[PDB]
Structures are given as structure tokens and as C-alpha cells.
Amino acid sequence: EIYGE
Amino acid sequence: EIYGE
Amino acid sequence: GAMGEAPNQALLRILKETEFKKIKVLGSGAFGTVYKGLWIPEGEKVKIPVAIKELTSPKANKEILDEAYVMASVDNPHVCRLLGICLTSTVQLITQLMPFGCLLDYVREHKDNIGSQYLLNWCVQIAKGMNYLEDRRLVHRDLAARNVLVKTPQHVKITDFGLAKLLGAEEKEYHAEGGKVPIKWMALESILHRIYTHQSDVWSYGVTVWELMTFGSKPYDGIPASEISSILEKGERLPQPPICTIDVYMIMVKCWMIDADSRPKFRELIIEFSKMARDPQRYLVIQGDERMHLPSEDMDDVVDADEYLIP
Amino acid sequence: GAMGEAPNQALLRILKETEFKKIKVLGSGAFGTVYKGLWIPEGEKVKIPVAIKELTSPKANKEILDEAYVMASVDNPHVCRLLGICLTSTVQLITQLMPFGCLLDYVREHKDNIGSQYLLNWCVQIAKGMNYLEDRRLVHRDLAARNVLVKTPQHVKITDFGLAKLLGAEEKEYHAEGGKVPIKWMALESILHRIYTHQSDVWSYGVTVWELMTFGSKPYDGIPASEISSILEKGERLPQPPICTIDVYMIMVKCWMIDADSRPKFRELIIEFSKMARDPQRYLVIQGDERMHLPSEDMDDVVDADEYLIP
Ligand SMILES: *NC(=O)CSP(=O)(O)OP(=O)(O)OP(=O)(O)OC[C@H]1O[C@@H](n2cnc3c(N)ncnc32)[C@H](O)[C@@H]1O
Numbered sequence: 092e093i094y095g096e
Numbered sequence: 097e098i099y100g101e
Numbered sequence: 102g103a104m105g106e107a108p109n110q111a112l113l114r115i116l117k118e119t120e121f122k123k124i125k126v127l128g129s130g131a132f133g134t135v136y137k138g139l140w141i142p143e144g145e146k147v148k149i150p151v152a153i154k155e156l157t158s159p160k161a162n163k164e165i166l167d168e169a170y171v172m173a174s175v176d177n178p179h180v181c182r183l184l185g186i187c188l189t190s191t192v193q194l195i196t197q198l199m200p201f202g203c204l205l206d207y208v209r210e211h212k213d214n215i216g217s218q219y220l221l222n223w224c225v226q227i228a229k230g231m232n233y234l235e236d237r238r239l240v241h242r243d244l245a246a247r248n249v250l251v252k253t254p255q256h257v258k259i260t261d262f263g264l265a266k267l268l269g270a271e272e273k274e275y276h277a278e279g280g281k282v283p284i285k286w287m288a289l290e291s292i293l294h295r296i297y298t299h300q301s302d303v304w305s306y307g308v309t310v311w312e313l314m315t316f317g318s319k320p321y322d323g324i325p326a327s328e329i330s331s332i333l334e335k336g337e338r339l340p341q342p343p344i345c346t347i348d349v350y351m352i353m354v355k356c357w358m359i360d361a362d363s364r365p366k367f368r369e370l371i372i373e374f375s376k377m378a379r380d381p382q383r384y385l386v387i388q389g390d391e392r393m394h395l396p397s398e399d400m401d402d403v404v405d406a407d408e409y410l411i412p
Numbered sequence: 413g414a415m416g417e418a419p420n421q422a423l424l425r426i427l428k429e430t431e432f433k434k435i436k437v438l439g440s441g442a443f444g445t446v447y448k449g450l451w452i453p454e455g456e457k458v459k460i461p462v463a464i465k466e467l468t469s470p471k472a473n474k475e476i477l478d479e480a481y482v483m484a485s486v487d488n489p490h491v492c493r494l495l496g497i498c499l500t501s502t503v504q505l506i507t508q509l510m511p512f513g514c515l516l517d518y519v520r521e522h523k524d525n526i527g528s529q530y531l532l533n534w535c536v537q538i539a540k541g542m543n544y545l546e547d548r549r550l551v552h553r554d555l556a557a558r559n560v561l562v563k564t565p566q567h568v569k570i571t572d573f574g575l576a577k578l579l580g581a582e583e584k585e586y587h588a589e590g591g592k593v594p595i596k597w598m599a600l601e602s603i604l605h606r607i608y609t610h611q612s613d614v615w616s617y618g619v620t621v622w623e624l625m626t627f628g629s630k631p632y633d634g635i636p637a638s639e640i641s642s643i644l645e646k647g648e649r650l651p652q653p654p655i656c657t658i659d660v661y662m663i664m665v666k667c668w669m670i671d672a673d674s675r676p677k678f679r680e681l682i683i684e685f686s687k688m689a690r691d692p693q694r695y696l697v698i699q700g701d702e703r704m705h706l707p708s709e710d711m712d713d714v715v716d717a718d719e720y721l722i723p
């Protein structure tokens with residue numbers, strides 16, 4: 092579900 | 097260019 | 102009950118900043134900056150000549166978006182078309198490029214070449230645009246020569262919807278609250294009571310025509326904005342332009358009646374000027390009108406916005 | 413000097429494990445396990461439907477407690493209520509049971525029954541919740557359809573405060589240091605500089621609405637999380653949902669402006685969507701919207717948490 096930057 | 101009332 | 106509202110299914114296109122090529126500035130001052138460039142949508146082999154307005158406070162954004170809202174909601178040959186917006190630092194409006202700028206500057210720059218035929222047809226064209234706008238139930242509130250663009254000497258369109266307002270199904274008027282508004286182009290009602298209607302747009306149409314017939318003269322030149330309201334109440338109006346016959350001046354005058362519903366309708370205006378366009382020199386007596394003519398990144402896949410009809 | 417801080421006298425209730433009756437699992441995976449059960453406080457004849465999260469390392473505990481801290485500190489009709497925690501092997505959060513689960517799953521499961529009225533009111537409800545949260549000076553940092561629960565189709569609440577942060581009296585932003593964060597729901601600022609504000613929560617609100625308007629579609633489906641930052645900088649944004657009028661899409665778009673202070677405030681959002689809720693079909697054009705409707709241990713002394721108001 093969308094992670095990391 | 098004409099303003100205010 | 103009375104008439105209701107229908108859904109506004111206008112599409113608001115959001116453009117990729119990497120699809121433009123700001124070729125050169127077109128102008129800036131009291132509105133932000135307007136550059137000139139091409140829009141090159143990925144894929145399709147199309148280059149569209151466009152105008153980029155890069156007008157960074159919340160007020161500015163909230164206002165340029167209200168504008169895009171209106172533009173994205175209208176579609177007519179005589180109304181400037183909106184291609185979309187770009188969401189960067191500050192919102193940019195992307196519109197069809199009008200190579201010859203605003204009509205006011207255009208007639209001032211070519212006084213010695215504006216024939217009666219061009220003038221009258223511009224009058225017809227502006228009326229068609231506004232008539233259209235009235236159907237959409239939209240009050241422009243800022244019609245004036247400076248807000249009319251020139252795609253070509255034969256084709257003009259109305260622009261600048263920064264003050265426009267969309268009325269309700271059976272709403273007869275718009276009550277503004279305050280702020281700077283161009284006095285010399287507004288109807289007496291608007292000045293005294295902040296009331297705006299299609300009919301007050303008609304008064305502005307009268308002044309726009311006058312500007313055109315005077316080849317770009319300033320309405321009530323010299324007279325202070327604060328005195329305008331007085332003059333009008335006293336019954337005074339703009340003078341009859343030298344090249345105008347009583348026929349044309351009469352139309353302008355009717356546009357400046359105190360009683361809004363007495364002024365003509367855009368649909369009538371379109372009819373009146375159309376007839377006159379069929380025998381130009383009979384309504385506008387212009388010197389040398391017989392010999393007056395007006396002219397017209399890499400030309401290859403360049404397509405004008407009017408031929409790039411995205412849904 | 414500037415404004416100071418007031419005491420946080422929230423009460424943190426510690427519950428007896430022998431007061432629950434884990435009726436059945438509700439879900440588990442990447443968060444631990446969530447069972448469904450009743451809370452039966454000794455004495456009082458009350459049975460409260462609840463959700464038990466049994467998420468055993470020090471990191472986990474330290475994190476689920478930070479969460480209970482936030483939940484125990486907020487009280488609003490549109491924010492999930494915390495009943496207390498249970499100190500066993502691993503800390504268990506006890507919350508009000510939301511029978512229909514998270515909104516994301518709910519709209520996906522009933523695409524063919526979500527009317528415009530339900531949608532718009534959910535938008536109003538979520539805005540009220542967040543607006544409340546802003547008053548408490550709390551930045552949620554993880555607003556998304558998956559983090560909105562459904563007590564009934566007519567009543568939703570915001571949940572999942574695992575990333576929430578409570579700002580100081582006059583603190584304008586929160587600077588995170590690192591770790592996994594849901595990119596597709598965060599504002600450009602957050603991605604590039606790890607800055608979080610109420611306004612970046614507004615950007616997340618825009619995406620949440622979009623999810624709802626697309627009946628559960630995945631934002632930027634297919635596009636890699638690592639590319640998102642690029643796309644946004646380039647000016648691209650999520651598409652206009654088929655059922656949306658330019659009015660609604662416009663609100664979403666404003667939520668995605670590069671300039672945080674330009675985006676709308678939750679209080680404004682509440683107002684905008686409230687007005688639209690009064691004439692639903694005028695802002696959302698949904699097929700068959702006219703006939704869409706949504707439904708609603710031993711029923712005796714069962715009382716919903718919203719009616720069991722312990723001090
Ligand atoms: N009192 C006032 O409201 C300001 S007077 P103004 O400066 O004439 O109008 P304003 O709204 O401030 O600016 P606008 O963007 O309407 O016009 C600025 C200049 O840019 C040129 N322009 C605008 N759109 C164009 C397109 N699509 N193509 C070519 N050129 C365009 C105008 O001619 C104007 O001088």
C-alpha cells in the first residue's frame with residue numbers, strides 16, 4: 092500500500 | 097484602467 | 102416549483118509542464134506574466150501555439166482557478182478556448198494563442214487600416230459571443246475592447262473571465278459586494294447598487310463598440326472615475342463617433358438607457374449589425390475605406406487549438 | 413512570549429482481559445490481528461461490541477502505545493473512539509466495533525449501490541473529523557479511504573493514528589526523519605522534505621475523496637512509488653473521476669496545489685460539500701443513482717460504544 096521515500 | 101466604486 | 106440546475110460536466114485538463122516551450126514573453130504587469138509557447142502532447146504529432154499565464158499567494162491561486170472554472174465551462178467560436186492548467190509553484194492557465202493580441206491595441210496600432218467591414222463584423226462577432234454567454238447564463242461583468250482577442254482580423258473572441266459569474270436557472274441578477282471594478286465600462290445600476298445582469302453586460306458592449314468606432318479612444322478620457330456616476334445620472338453619455346451614422350450611434354445609445362430591460366438583447370444586436378455588414382459604407386463613413394486591408398516553432402505539425410478538438 | 417501548552421488530562425482506561433469475548437477474527441496480516449468481540453464490564457448490565465487489536469517486541473509495544481495515547485486524547489463523532497487497552501503478553505487496543513469495516517473495502521464491495529448522497533456526506537463527515545483533528549493541533553499523516561471506518565452507511569469515522577503527531581501551540585509543521593510512509597497519499601512537500609502539516613493532510617483528503625469517487629480505484633495504479641515525486645513536480649495529477657462534475661474535481665485539484673497554504677481548509681471543505689449534499693445529482697452524475705440504497709452476542713443489553721459514555 093505504497094511505502095518508502 | 098478605471099477601478100473602484 | 103421553479104426550474105432547477107443541471108450538472109456541469111465540463112472537463113478540466115491538467116497539463117504536464119514538460120509539454121510546453123515558452124518561446125518568449127508576451128506581456129506582464131498587473132496580472133502576472135503571459136508568455137507565448139507551444140504545447141506538444143506526448144505521442145500525437147501535434148504542436149499547438151498557446152499563451153501561458155503564470156499569474157504566489159492563496160488569493161491569486163483561488164482567483165485564477167475560479168477563472169479556469171468558467172473558461173473550462175464555455176465552448177463557442179467567439180469565446181477564448183481554455184486548453185488546461187498547469188499545477189506548479191503558481192497555477193498557469195493555458196489558452197489558444199491569439200497572434201494579434203487584444204482588439205483595443207490592434208485598432209490603435211492600425212487606425213489607418215481599419216475598414217467599416219472589419220469593424221461591423223467584429224461587432225457581430227462580439228455580440229454572438231456574448232449572446233452565447235447569456236445562454237450559458239453567465240454574466241461577464243468585464244466586457245471591453247481590451248478583453249477581446251484577435252485570432253485574425255476576420256476572427257475575434259471574448260476573453261478575461263476573471264470577474265464572470267454564473268447565475269442560477271431563473272436568477273435575474275448578481276449582487277457583488279465590493280472591490281475594484283472598471284467604472285467607465287459599467288452600467289449605472291452596477292455602479293450604484295452593485296447589480297449585474299446580461300443587460301449590464303449590454304451596456305459594456307455599447308462602450309466596447311464605441312472604443313472600436315473611435316479607433317481606440319479612451320471613454321470619458323480625463324474624467325475622474327468618481328465623477329462618472331454623476332454624469333450618467335445627469336443623462337450625459339459618450340459622444341457620437343465621427344465615422345458613425347445616426348443608425349450606429351442609436352444602437353450604442355440604446356445600450357446606455359437607464360432602464361436595463363429597455364436596452365437591446367445580444368440576439369437583436371447580432372441581427373442589427375449583420376444587416377449593416379451587408380452594406381458597410383452606408384453606416385460607417387470612413388476616409389480611404391475603399392483601400393483598407395488587414396494582413397493574416399517550425400511550421401510542419403503546427404495545429405491551431407481550433408483544430409485540436411480533445412473531448 | 414508566544415502561546416503555551418495546556419495539560420492533557422485524557423484518561424487512559426486499562427481493561428480486564430476477562431471482560432472480553434473474542435467472538436471471531438476480523439482480519440490479520442501486516443499490523444497484527446484484529447478480532448471482534450464484546451466488552452462486558454463487571455456490574456453494569458452492558459455488552460459493548462468492540463474490536464480487539466492484539467498487535468511482541470519492544471518496538472511494537474512502544475508503537476501501539478503511542479497510538480493509544482493519541483486515540484485516548486481525541487473525542488469527536490467522526491473520530492474512532494478508544495475504549496482502553498489490555499496489558500497482556502502484547503498490548504491490545506480496544507475500540508468501538510465498526511460493523512462494515514473500512515470505507516475503501518465498503519465502496520469496492522458495493523460499487524453498484526453507492527449513491528451520490530452517501531458519497532458527498534461521507535466527504536462532509538471526513539472533513540468534520542479532520543477539521544476537529546486540526547483543532548486538537550494533530551496531524552494525522554495517514555488519511556486514506558483504508559483508514560476510514562463505517563459504523564453505518566450514514567456514519568463514518570477516521571481511524572489509524574499510528575503515524576499521527578501532536579504539534580505545539582504555535583508549531584506550523586512536523587519534520588519526520590525516516591521510515592515507510594504511503595507515498596501515493598502524501599503531499600509533494602512531505603515526499604521531498606518530510607514536512608507534515610494540516611495542509612498536507614488536506615492533500616491526503618483529496619486522494620481519499622478521489623478513491624471514493626472512483627469507487628475504490630488505486631491512485632496512480634501501476635506507477636512505481638519512486639516515480640510519483642517526478643510526476644507531481646511535472647504538474648501531473650490524478651484524473652477527473654467519470655461521475656464527477658468540474659465542481660467536485662476542482663475541489664480535489666485545489667487539494668493538490670504545490671503551495672500548501674493555497675489548498676483549502678477542512679472548515680471550507682465541510683462547507684463546500686455540505687452545500688453540494690443538498691442537491692447531490694447536480695455534482696455527481698451517477699447511473700441508476702435514483703434506486704441506490706444501502707442497508708444498516710445476544711441483542712438484549714447490547715449498547716454501542718457511542719451510548720456507553722464513561723468519563
Ligand atoms: N484593471 C484591470 O483589470 C487590468 S487591465 P489589463 O492589464 O488589460 O487586464 P488583465 O486582466 O490584467 O490581463 P490579461 O491577462 O487579460 O491580459 C494581459 C495582456 O496579455 C495579452 N493576452 C492575454 N491573453 C492572450 C492570448 N490568449 N494570446 C495573446 N495575447 C494575450 C493581452 O493582449 C494583454 O495586453
Ligand SMILES: *NC(=O)CSP(=O)(O)OP(=O)(O)OP(=O)(O)OC[C@H]1O[C@@H](n2cnc3c(N)ncnc32)[C@H](O)[C@@H]1O
Pocket residue numbers: 092093094438439441442443446463465507508509510511513514558561571572574594
Ligand atoms: N501500509 C500500511 O500501513 C498497512 S495497510 P493496512 O493493512 O490497511 O493498515 P494497518 O494499519 O496495517 O491495519 P489496521 O489495524 O488499520 O486495519 C486492519 C484491518 O482491520 C479492520 N479494522 C480495523 N479497525 C476496525 C474496527 N474498529 N472495526 C472493524 N474493523 C476494523 C480494517 O477494515 C482493516 O481491513
Ligand SMILES: [Cl-]
Pocket residue numbers: 264277278279280
Ligand atoms: Cl466581484
Ligand SMILES: [Cl-]
Pocket residue numbers: 575588589590591
Ligand atoms: Cl514517522
